[PDB]
Amino acid sequence: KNSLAYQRMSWEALKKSINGLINKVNISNISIIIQELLQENIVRGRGLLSRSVLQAQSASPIFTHVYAALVAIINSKFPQIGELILKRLILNFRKGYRRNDKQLCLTASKFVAHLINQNVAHEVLCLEMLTLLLERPTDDSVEVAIGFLKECGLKLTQVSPRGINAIFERLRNILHESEIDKRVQYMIEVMFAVRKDGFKDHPIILEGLDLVEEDDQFTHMLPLEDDYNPEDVLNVFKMDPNFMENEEKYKAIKKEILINLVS
Amino acid sequence: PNVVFIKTEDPDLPAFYFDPLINPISHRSQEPLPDDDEEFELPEFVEPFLKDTPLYTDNTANG
Fold this sequence. Notes:
Number of helices of chain B: 0
PDB class: splicing
Organism of A: Homo sapiens
Entry title: Structural organization of a late activated human spliceosome (Baqr, core region)
Keywords: Spliceosome, helicase, Prp2, Aquarius, catalytic activation, splicing
Distance between the termini of chain B: 21 Å
Strand content of chain B: under 5%
Oligomer: part of a larger assembly
Number of strands of chain B: 0
Chain A: Pre-mRNA-splicing factor CWC22 homolog
Radius of gyration of chain A: 21 Å
Shape of chain A: globular
Distance between the termini of chain A: 90 Å
């Protein structure tokens, strides 16, 4: 009908505005991206915004900070959207671990480190993923752990140093007791330098993107091995018979969330 | 010689513990080992000397 076609056109315009905000995302110009996110439906298009943030995090590493800012803003708007984004990130990390692909697991680890750095996901699941990467001796797992350490050394120092000590002991046992090549020794040296410096050059907290208050934001402990819900049902628009009440609720939510010389 | 003595703050830590102030060893060409289980199994009732004794008590770090 005409109402379903108008809802589909509004959803397509919201997806196009989200794609234009993700493509033109800047660190110094995040207010335009926040206004483009607030212009569309934030509750009805939360799954589409999470998919656009995941695509911007996977496509480029520079847009990972903007995706973490959007995830933190979505978590500060509602804890269910942040929990769904953390569950989708945990499911993507589990899929990248099970698929045995280095680039997909590296992008999932970077997205998980950006989500933990934006105070949107719990650090226990990231610590368990780092322990699973340390328990499995591989070059790509050590590189992903070194990338997570360089991304969130401040979070690892503020959370738990016993995991860093266990990672150092595992790297020492990998260098001598296990087989270590020149690249594995370079990765172990990079992990030792990241543990010694504590990621002081690139800390966990990123400036210019943290515009969401941590008091209104909630942290969800969504494991990778658990049955995490991606909440992608709300990303595609459906012919809701109560769509006028949903539009009124979205409008109300957007309105509420807005001499001496001589001496 | 320089007394490299590490002062511990919290008593929750063990008395023998790798401090973060110490630089890591980061150990990275064969050893003259005997044959694996060829002979020489240990007899009964031999042990390390202080197996029943704990490694550290609460007074160890203070001492």
